[PDB]
Design an enzyme around this catalytic site. Structure first.
Site, PDB file in Angstrom:
ATOM      1  N   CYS A  53       1.430   5.714  -1.095  1.00  0.00           N
ATOM      2  CA  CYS A  53       1.496   4.453  -1.260  1.00  0.00           C
ATOM      3  C   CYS A  53       2.624   3.961  -1.683  1.00  0.00           C
ATOM      4  O   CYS A  53       3.295   3.998  -2.869  1.00  0.00           O
ATOM      5  CB  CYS A  53       0.226   3.580  -1.874  1.00  0.00           C
ATOM      6  SG  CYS A  53       0.790   1.733  -2.032  1.00  0.00           S
ATOM      7  N   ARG A  70       2.835  -0.021  -4.106  1.00  0.00           N
ATOM      8  CA  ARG A  70       2.120   0.100  -5.630  1.00  0.00           C
ATOM      9  C   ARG A  70       2.405  -0.905  -6.439  1.00  0.00           C
ATOM     10  O   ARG A  70       1.825  -0.994  -7.397  1.00  0.00           O
ATOM     11  CB  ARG A  70       2.083   1.627  -6.162  1.00  0.00           C
ATOM     12  CG  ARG A  70       1.064   2.370  -5.174  1.00  0.00           C
ATOM     13  CD  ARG A  70       1.066   3.762  -6.091  1.00  0.00           C
ATOM     14  NE  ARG A  70       2.092   4.482  -5.888  1.00  0.00           N
ATOM     15  CZ  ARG A  70       2.675   5.721  -6.138  1.00  0.00           C
ATOM     16  NH1 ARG A  70       1.683   6.340  -7.220  1.00  0.00           N
ATOM     17  NH2 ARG A  70       3.433   6.346  -5.807  1.00  0.00           N
ATOM     18  N   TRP A 125      -0.968  -5.849   3.193  1.00  0.00           N
ATOM     19  CA  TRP A 125      -0.261  -6.344   4.294  1.00  0.00           C
ATOM     20  C   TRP A 125       0.586  -4.974   5.028  1.00  0.00           C
ATOM     21  O   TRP A 125       0.633  -3.718   4.354  1.00  0.00           O
ATOM     22  CB  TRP A 125       0.727  -7.263   4.082  1.00  0.00           C
ATOM     23  CG  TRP A 125       1.647  -7.087   2.806  1.00  0.00           C
ATOM     24  CD1 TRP A 125       2.732  -6.259   2.815  1.00  0.00           C
ATOM     25  CD2 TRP A 125       1.294  -7.577   1.637  1.00  0.00           C
ATOM     26  NE1 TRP A 125       3.270  -6.467   1.500  1.00  0.00           N
ATOM     27  CE2 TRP A 125       2.528  -7.180   0.729  1.00  0.00           C
ATOM     28  CE3 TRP A 125       0.350  -8.541   1.088  1.00  0.00           C
ATOM     29  CZ2 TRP A 125       2.579  -7.600  -0.650  1.00  0.00           C
ATOM     30  CZ3 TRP A 125       0.488  -8.903  -0.166  1.00  0.00           C
ATOM     31  CH2 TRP A 125       1.641  -8.415  -1.254  1.00  0.00           C
ATOM     32  N   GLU A 155       4.902   0.896  10.096  1.00  0.00           N
ATOM     33  CA  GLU A 155       3.912   1.439  10.562  1.00  0.00           C
ATOM     34  C   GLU A 155       3.319   1.074  11.891  1.00  0.00           C
ATOM     35  O   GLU A 155       2.580   1.565  12.651  1.00  0.00           O
ATOM     36  CB  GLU A 155       2.604   0.867   9.633  1.00  0.00           C
ATOM     37  CG  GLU A 155       3.116   1.235   8.170  1.00  0.00           C
ATOM     38  CD  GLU A 155       1.837   0.745   6.988  1.00  0.00           C
ATOM     39  OE1 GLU A 155       0.879   1.622   7.141  1.00  0.00           O
ATOM     40  OE2 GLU A 155       2.015  -0.176   6.576  1.00  0.00           O
TER      41      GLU A 155
HETATM   42  C1  HEM Z   1       0.228  -4.467  -0.410  1.00  0.00           C
HETATM   43  C2  HEM Z   1       0.385  -3.962   0.827  1.00  0.00           C
HETATM   44  C3  HEM Z   1       0.535  -2.688   1.154  1.00  0.00           C
HETATM   45  C4  HEM Z   1       1.697  -1.807   1.744  1.00  0.00           C
HETATM   46  C5  HEM Z   1       2.776  -2.664   2.341  1.00  0.00           C
HETATM   47  C6  HEM Z   1       1.070  -0.498   1.664  1.00  0.00           C
HETATM   48  C7  HEM Z   1       1.954   0.510   2.228  1.00  0.00           C
HETATM   49  C8  HEM Z   1       1.210   1.886   2.439  1.00  0.00           C
HETATM   50  C9  HEM Z   1       2.087   2.524   3.391  1.00  0.00           C
HETATM   51  C10 HEM Z   1       3.150   2.405   4.209  1.00  0.00           C
HETATM   52  C11 HEM Z   1       1.155   3.684   3.366  1.00  0.00           C
HETATM   53  C12 HEM Z   1       1.495   4.940   4.239  1.00  0.00           C
HETATM   54  C13 HEM Z   1       1.144   4.740   5.561  1.00  0.00           C
HETATM   55  C14 HEM Z   1       1.477   5.852   6.567  1.00  0.00           C
HETATM   56  O1  HEM Z   1       2.505   5.778   6.880  1.00  0.00           O
HETATM   57  O2  HEM Z   1       0.724   6.685   6.825  1.00  0.00           O
HETATM   58  C15 HEM Z   1       0.159   3.440   2.403  1.00  0.00           C
HETATM   59  C16 HEM Z   1      -0.617   4.408   2.169  1.00  0.00           C
HETATM   60  C17 HEM Z   1      -1.684   4.080   1.259  1.00  0.00           C
HETATM   61  N1  HEM Z   1      -1.992   2.914   0.677  1.00  0.00           N
HETATM   62 FE1  HEM Z   1      -1.044   1.504   0.397  1.00  0.00          FE
HETATM   63  N2  HEM Z   1       0.103  -0.316   0.985  1.00  0.00           N
HETATM   64  C18 HEM Z   1      -0.481  -1.418   0.547  1.00  0.00           C
HETATM   65  C19 HEM Z   1      -1.442  -2.068  -0.171  1.00  0.00           C
HETATM   66  C20 HEM Z   1      -2.351  -0.841  -0.793  1.00  0.00           C
HETATM   67  C21 HEM Z   1      -3.701  -1.081  -1.242  1.00  0.00           C
HETATM   68  C22 HEM Z   1      -4.276  -2.968  -1.412  1.00  0.00           C
HETATM   69  C23 HEM Z   1      -4.332  -0.026  -1.581  1.00  0.00           C
HETATM   70  C24 HEM Z   1      -5.742   0.160  -1.941  1.00  0.00           C
HETATM   71  C25 HEM Z   1      -5.926  -0.339  -3.268  1.00  0.00           C
HETATM   72  C26 HEM Z   1      -3.386   0.782  -1.007  1.00  0.00           C
HETATM   73  C27 HEM Z   1      -3.677   2.292  -1.146  1.00  0.00           C
HETATM   74  C28 HEM Z   1      -3.102   3.268  -0.255  1.00  0.00           C
HETATM   75  C29 HEM Z   1      -3.642   4.522   0.016  1.00  0.00           C
HETATM   76  C30 HEM Z   1      -4.841   5.134  -0.690  1.00  0.00           C
HETATM   77  C31 HEM Z   1      -2.667   5.155   0.980  1.00  0.00           C
HETATM   78  C32 HEM Z   1      -2.962   6.455   1.495  1.00  0.00           C
HETATM   79  C33 HEM Z   1      -3.960   6.543   2.676  1.00  0.00           C
HETATM   80  C34 HEM Z   1      -3.960   7.863   3.395  1.00  0.00           C
HETATM   81  O3  HEM Z   1      -4.735   8.795   2.768  1.00  0.00           O
HETATM   82  O4  HEM Z   1      -3.484   7.880   4.259  1.00  0.00           O
HETATM   83  N3  HEM Z   1      -2.267   0.086  -0.571  1.00  0.00           N
HETATM   84  N4  HEM Z   1       0.224   2.268   1.749  1.00  0.00           N
HETATM   85  C1  LIG Z   2      -3.976  -0.159   2.418  1.00  0.00           C
HETATM   86  C2  LIG Z   2      -2.962   0.118   3.148  1.00  0.00           C
HETATM   87  C3  LIG Z   2      -2.000  -0.339   3.714  1.00  0.00           C
HETATM   88  C4  LIG Z   2      -1.027  -0.039   4.733  1.00  0.00           C
HETATM   89  N1  LIG Z   2       0.135  -0.920   4.787  1.00  0.00           N
HETATM   90  N2  LIG Z   2      -1.034   1.021   5.074  1.00  0.00           N
HETATM   91  C5  LIG Z   2      -2.333   1.891   4.676  1.00  0.00           C
HETATM   92  C6  LIG Z   2      -2.266   3.298   5.386  1.00  0.00           C
HETATM   93  C7  LIG Z   2      -3.004   2.946   6.720  1.00  0.00           C
HETATM   94  C8  LIG Z   2      -2.917   4.321   7.724  1.00  0.00           C
HETATM   95  C9  LIG Z   2      -2.716   4.107   8.991  1.00  0.00           C
HETATM   96  N3  LIG Z   2      -2.818   5.113   9.702  1.00  0.00           N
HETATM   97  C10 LIG Z   2      -3.137   6.431   9.185  1.00  0.00           C
HETATM   98  C11 LIG Z   2      -3.232   6.611   8.118  1.00  0.00           C
HETATM   99  C12 LIG Z   2      -3.728   7.820   7.515  1.00  0.00           C
HETATM  100  C13 LIG Z   2      -4.947   8.618   8.212  1.00  0.00           C
HETATM  101  C14 LIG Z   2      -5.234   9.974   7.559  1.00  0.00           C
HETATM  102  C15 LIG Z   2      -5.807  10.801   8.265  1.00  0.00           C
HETATM  103  C16 LIG Z   2      -6.261  12.141   7.519  1.00  0.00           C
HETATM  104  C17 LIG Z   2      -6.755  13.150   8.259  1.00  0.00           C
HETATM  105  N4  LIG Z   2      -5.810  12.070   6.174  1.00  0.00           N
HETATM  106  C18 LIG Z   2      -5.482  11.138   5.371  1.00  0.00           C
HETATM  107  N5  LIG Z   2      -5.349  11.345   4.148  1.00  0.00           N
HETATM  108  C19 LIG Z   2      -5.147   9.947   6.029  1.00  0.00           C
HETATM  109  C20 LIG Z   2      -3.254   5.508   7.150  1.00  0.00           C
HETATM  110  C21 LIG Z   2      -3.072   1.414   3.866  1.00  0.00           C
END
Ligand code: HEM
Ligand SMILES: Cc1cc(N)nc(CCc2cncc(CCc3cc(C)nc(N)c3)c2)c1
Ligand code: HEM
Ligand SMILES: Cc1cc(N)nc(CCc2cncc(CCc3cc(C)nc(N)c3)c2)c1
Ligand SMILES: C[C@H](O)[C@H](O)[C@H]1CNc2nc(N)[nH]c(=O)c2N1
Ligand SMILES: C[C@H](O)[C@H](O)[C@H]1CNc2nc(N)[nH]c(=O)c2N1
Ligand SMILES: [Cl-]
Ligand SMILES: [Cl-]
Lengths: 362, 362
Positions: A65, A68, A237, A242
């Site tokens: 993330c 953070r 947001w 993305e």
């Molecule tokens: C404030 C706005 C936020 C932005 C802009 C943001 C941005 C991102 C981005 C760009 C990713 C990677 C997505 C990708 O390219 O695959 C990501 C992953 C992640 N974010 Fe955030 N995030 C935000 C808020 C949060 C919040 C509120 C949480 C939870 C408390 C969180 C937890 C995570 C987690 C767990 C992942 C990894 C998910 C996965 O396994 O693919 N984020 N975040």
């Molecule tokens: C809270 C939050 C905010 C944000 N801007 N983006 C995200 C990640 C969104 C997101 C979108 N598409 C794909 C993924 C990953 C999907 C994904 C799939 C598998 C197989 N393993 C993983 N660990 C993760 C994440 C989360």
């Protein structure tokens, strides 16, 4: 055996959580109470502070993330009291409403009852509470290909989409005891969508592109001190990349680069013209422009990287060890223009944290 | 102790090299000859086939190289016979000339005598045979900041640059026995340079940008079967991103994005305008255009990724295990538009290979 694991994760979490909260003295007693509760009930129950903070710590430890920095401002909703599928449904509706906030998106998590004996009380089938349906049949690709499995699984249960490219998937989840999940059609008044337009190219609107405002992840497990909250949808947001570089650009998704290249008046014939790279930028300029023009929160990858840098600085100043996943932290457009590209990160997993869990269907 | 290492690396290399060459029967004898040669001389000597192939295997095992598809067409020059600093100098001059080939760049490596007892026979101070000088004094930044140390080290030895932004650094190397290195001014007739212009923006020429045509790496050690060729300059052609997204774009390098943004008529005030991303593309379009217009070989990252994909396929078909470094393989512009982004690679180090070695100065 299990009660040993739960006990060790409880000692670690409480001692750390109460240290950050400034309640190091209250550790001793709370530990003893937990020791008895695990001894008799087989599992302990979190206080509202421990849960709220544990969810904030989990975000802070999300190596992948980039946003953070605002981990401590996470709006935590405690719905561990739900028992019926109407309470869960309404809780999901509420989360969408409060997190959207007319466009001023609030980073919010809704926490449902955890796995009791490893047995899920609630089981959410959605990967995101708001997502578009996907259809693939007779060589005809419609909507979001990433949602093909869930869409078909929804349609096995009496749901039917209008087969547009942006059909709102229904909220679908299963209760403990129920053999089948229930589905509820999303009230469109709860869903903010943003039509994609270009700041200086009027022909961009001919593409008729759009996306939902709020990404609400609902396929991950919140683990806090040995307790497994498998159903804890969280949102923030969007980082513009993305939407414009993955959701709308990928060949395995909406695959819009050729059409984007056409409306901006460049040829999509030669690699050396870098038409993909050029279309990617203009599409991403359009996305950011469209969200700002509508009043829906969004961040560009340069600003996000600057914020993540302050997070790194804040971490060192607090004596906190930093963890991150370089491969996910770098933005898919101009990654070398960020500081993240030019430094390394420890990909060690620190708990509390969010863990991906496979869906019951495909 | 050492002769054990050399013996094991020799067994591994010869048995593998001769298998690929189709001389599995000749392994037995050649092994015995080597066994005696190491026993008596303390080190064995490669045949021209073993050296030529070992250098090709080394390229094939470069985890961070995206252009490995043409590993088998590497032009190998065997200059293990040099003894004087004039022979080495002329060999370096020749490499530049033959590899450039009027613009039709030939992937070439020149191999000098290896480390005898760990003692370098030749010691090249250049990181690349053709590079620009860098000057930093009185808050005044001139040329390539990456070359500041070598430039100052050259100027400690009687060399003086004209202090332009593109001063050709001299060939500087040290012989075994010599306490100081010698330097030779690069004959400019041997160096092809490409002025950067834009296909549709005439104002781009006002930036007066340019780069050298051929990247000839001379800071890495060629390791083949326990033998350490510390001085083995190798070259290919450029992937456009290297020039436009790193050399000319980086703040720690030429830092041209703001000036590029100005000449293309966009504002460099707001992040959400993605002016850096937009300037990066147009600059890279200019680089590719300029090289193609001049007749100097070059490849775009999309074509390069397509070629690297065939390399992956070729590897599987030959029964060869593939190794790669994801963090280096992805291009710094639109990496998600390549297949490399969406798959993983084993970063295991397989010999023969090229290894980075720190320079005697800074
Ligand atoms: C404030 C706005 C936020 C932005 C802009 C943001 C941005 C991102 C981005 C760009 C990713 C990677 C997505 C990708 O390219 O695959 C990501 C992953 C992640 N974010 Fe955030 N995030 C935000 C808020 C949060 C919040 C509120 C949480 C939870 C408390 C969180 C937890 C995570 C987690 C767990 C992942 C990894 C998910 C996965 O396994 O693919 N984020 N975040
Ligand atoms: C809270 C939050 C905010 C944000 N801007 N983006 C995200 C990640 C969104 C997101 C979108 N598409 C794909 C993924 C990953 C999907 C994904 C799939 C598998 C197989 N393993 C993983 N660990 C993760 C994440 C989360
Ligand atoms: C045919 C033209 C070639 C192209 C387009 C090419 C492309 C590249 C690129 C883009 C990199 C990474 C540079 C970076 O972003 O930091 C790289 C690294 C590398 N290439 Fe190649 N390459 C070519 C030929 C060769 C040849 C002929 C050799 C040697 C036999 C070679 C060996 C390597 C090595 C060793 C590295 C890693 C160097 C390091 O430690 O940084 N490549 N290549
Ligand atoms: C044969 C060849 C062709 C090509 N197109 N690029 C390259 C890489 C050129 C290149 C340019 N700038 C920087 C580097 C890396 C420098 C470098 C520095 C350190 C400290 N360790 C390393 N392993 C490597 C490589 C090599
Ligand atoms: C920490 C990080 O992995 C490291 O700095 C890598 C990132 N990817 C890279 N990519 C290129 N092209 N060149 C580099 O030197 C690096 N360095
Ligand atoms: C193999 C590779 O590390 C893996 O596919 C990563 C690459 N970086 C990524 N970056 C983003 N944004 N999302 C992803 O799913 C991945 N996957
Ligand atoms: Cl998404
Ligand atoms: Cl270079």
């Amino acid at each position: 055996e299990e009660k040993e694991i739960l006990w060790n994760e409880a000692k670690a979490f409480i001692a750390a959580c109460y240290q950050e909260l400034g309640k190091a003295a209250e550790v001793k007693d709370r530990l003893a109470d937990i020791k008895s509760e695990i001894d008799l009930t087989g599992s302990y129950v979190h206080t509202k502070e421990e849960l709220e903070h544990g969810a904030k710590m989990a975000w802070r430890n999300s190596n992948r993330c980039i946003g953070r920095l605002f981990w401590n401002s996470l709006n935590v909703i405690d719905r561990r009291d739900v028992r019926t599928k109407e309470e869960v449904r309404d809780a999901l509706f509420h989360h969408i409403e409060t997190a959207t906030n007319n466009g001023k998106i609030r980073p919010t998590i809704t926490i449902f009852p955890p796995e009791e004996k490893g047995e899920k009380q609630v089981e959410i089938w959605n990967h995101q509470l708001i997502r578009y349906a996907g259809y693939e049949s007779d060589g005809e690709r419609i909507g979001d290909p990433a949602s093909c499995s869930l869409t078909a699984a929804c349609e096995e249960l009496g749901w039917r989409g209008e087969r547009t490219d942006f059909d709102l998937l229904p909220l679908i989840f299963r209760m403990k005891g129920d053999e089948q999940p229930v589905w509820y059609e999303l009230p469109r008044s709860l869903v903010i969508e943003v039509p994609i337009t270009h700041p200086d190219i009027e022909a961009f609107s001919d593409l008729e592109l759009k996306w939902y405002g709020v990404p609400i992840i609902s396929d991950m497990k919140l683990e806090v001190g040995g307790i497994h909250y498998n159903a804890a949808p969280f949102n923030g947001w969007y980082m513009g990349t993305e939407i414009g570089a993955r959701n709308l650009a990928d060949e395995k998704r909406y695959d819009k680069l050729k059409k984007v290249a056409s409306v901006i008046g460049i040829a999509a014939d030669y690699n050396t013209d870098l038409w993909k790279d050029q279309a990617l930028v203009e599409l991403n300029k359009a996305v950011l422009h469209s969200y700002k023009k509508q009043g829906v929160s969004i961040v560009d990858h340069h600003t996000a990287a600057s914020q993540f840098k302050r997070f790194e600085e804040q971490a060192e100043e607090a004596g906190r060890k930093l963890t991150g996943d370089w491969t996910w932290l770098i933005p898919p457009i101009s990654p070398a223009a960020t500081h993240i590209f030019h430094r390394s990160y420890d990909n060690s997993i620190v708990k509390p944290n969010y863990f991906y869990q496979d869906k019951p269907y495909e």
